[PDB]
């Protein structure tokens, strides 16, 4: 049994999301009924590998809200992850992927010394971040994108927002050390982490965010942002590629205009239809086919029967995970999402 | 952290609370033997069970400087003592049930959850025991109503309407007293709804009852 933790953008998808599927008192309240709403098992999931292995899987609603950090609420985010994770052990789930902000809780606010929830200790190779997987799909976007747009990213510079996050320096990495990136922008807030990052790679300049967009012909969204900015286009090169792989979107706006490109990053599509209605509320271009690269790591490790933490902490991702991972994301039926055209 | 002063003010009535609440959960559980005859002697056991834990949290207020308001606890139960009192003077059992097994058994672990992390070293040993009793106490009603479940669905749902609703009164009358010693309400709701979901889910409701009924008057 695999498991998917996630959570909502904001309190107005909440709202959306649970004025859908019935559930008209969830829909109403305010941030406070999320600050202690528990955790629930919201859909169960079937996936069927191009393998033809048939696995199984539930979503699971932490009720963790972006909002909570930016109102300081930071012992109400940490309980959400916690209180999900016990949720997870308790019904059984062998690998469940910590999404999107519940990761970065879970390191933030060294959750790894609260594991002792209620009842429950919780079992730290029960969960993985998947963010081996996304980092992957991220570089593979950006391979993908440059050849389809005729640019030759050996030539290009490639700014990577959060570079040193956990998936920001696994992409720097592999896009360095497998596909030859021509320069490296690395862009992150906390000074002695990129320095550190700059000195492993052996290359890349350090820009605050405001400088490395206009470099840039390739930004990778991969930051820690609770609410997301905005970008005027006019900032940009031309042609301009943003891989925005945020959740919640580092992109607060629609970027568009002439020679600028946006694509969804660390979003897979599988060959084949998935039943469930959570992608529909995440908001895929096919909600059926596409998923989150993280939750799609749990789906893989499951498929593999590697019941381990196999994303865990911070700036721990290597190239070989990568590859292994990668591996069996094509194997199974996944493919990155690709720009769309016309 | 000086636990004198408004400390024992605020620790006067909710020391209080939870001896009237241990007391009427022995007396909830000694009537509910009168209600369920193959099963009376168990249900002594649990009442038994409840009797020491009373006599526990007597000594935290005696640790302290502490004498309870029993007035005041008696006040903040009878909403839940009339409704336990009328459903079982009309053999309504699966009423009782859910006030006592289900309803207030969750409010013990929520509050004893929230208690023990900043009670005093005294304090914090002795709600770490009784907590794994509350645990089983609420598997009791679990296997009764789930092993009755077709049979009961209806009218727990009737009484989860009647009686929730008051989890959220006691729970913002005694919301100031309970910050003082060191409880979040919020902390309280969230512990209370997950006791509270996963016995629902136990007895045998979805996820979709669960979201209805555990946030019912809320
Ligand atoms: N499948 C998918 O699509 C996935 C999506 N994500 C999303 O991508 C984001 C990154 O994930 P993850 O690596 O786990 O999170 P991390 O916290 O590891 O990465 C964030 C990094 O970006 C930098 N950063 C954060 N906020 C800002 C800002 N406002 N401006 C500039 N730099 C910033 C930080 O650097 P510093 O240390 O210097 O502050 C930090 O190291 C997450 O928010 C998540 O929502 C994550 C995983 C998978
Ligand atoms: C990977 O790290 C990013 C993961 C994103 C987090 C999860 C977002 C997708 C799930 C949202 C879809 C529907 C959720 C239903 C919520 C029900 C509330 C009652
Ligand atoms: C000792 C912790 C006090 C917590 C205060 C929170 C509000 C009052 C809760 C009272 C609950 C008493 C339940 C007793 C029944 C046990 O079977
Ligand atoms: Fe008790
Ligand atoms: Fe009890």
Known sequence: ?????????????????????????????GLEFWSSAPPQIVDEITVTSATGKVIHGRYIESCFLPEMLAARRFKTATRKVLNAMSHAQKHGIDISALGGFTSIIFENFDLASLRQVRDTTLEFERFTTGNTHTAYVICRQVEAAAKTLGIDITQATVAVVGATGDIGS?????????????????????QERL??????????????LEAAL??????????????????????????????????????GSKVQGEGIYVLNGGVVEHCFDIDWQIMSAAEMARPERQMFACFAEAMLLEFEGWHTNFSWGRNQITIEKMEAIGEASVRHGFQPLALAIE | D???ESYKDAYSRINA????????????????????????????????????????????????????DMGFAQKFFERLHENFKAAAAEGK??????????????????AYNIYIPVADAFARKITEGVVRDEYLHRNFGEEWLKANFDASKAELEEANRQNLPLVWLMLNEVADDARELGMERESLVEDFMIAYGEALENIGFTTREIMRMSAYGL
């Open chain 1, 1 to 29: 049994m695999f498991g998917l933790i996630g959570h909502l953008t904001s309190l107005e998808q909440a709202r959306d999301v649970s004025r859908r599927m019935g559930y008209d008192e969830y829909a109403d309240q």
């Open chain 2, 17 to 68: 609370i939870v001896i009237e609440g241990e007391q009427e959960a022995f007396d909830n559980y000694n009537r509910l033997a009168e209600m369920l005859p193959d099963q009376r002697d168990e249900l002594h056991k649990l009442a038994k069970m409840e009797q020491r834990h009373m006599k526990g949290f007597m000594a935290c207020g005696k640790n302290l400087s502490v004498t309870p």
């Open chain 1, 214 to 251: 206009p470099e840039a012909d390739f930004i990778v969204w991969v930051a820690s942002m609770p609410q997301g900015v905005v970008i005027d286009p006019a900032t940009l090169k031309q042609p301009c590629v943003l891989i925005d792989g945020g959740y919640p979107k580092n992109l």
């Open chain 1, 195 to 208: 320095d550190n990052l700059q000195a492993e790679l052996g290359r890349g300049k350090i820009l605050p």
């Open chain 1, 170 to 190: 696994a992409v720097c990495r592999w896009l360095d050390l497998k596909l030859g990136v021509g320069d490296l922008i690395l862009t992150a807030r906390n």
């Open chain 2, 93 to 110: 059992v699966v009423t009782c049930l859910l006030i006592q097994s289900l309803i207030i058994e969750c409010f013990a672990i929520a």
């Open chain 2, 2 to 4: 000086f636990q004198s």
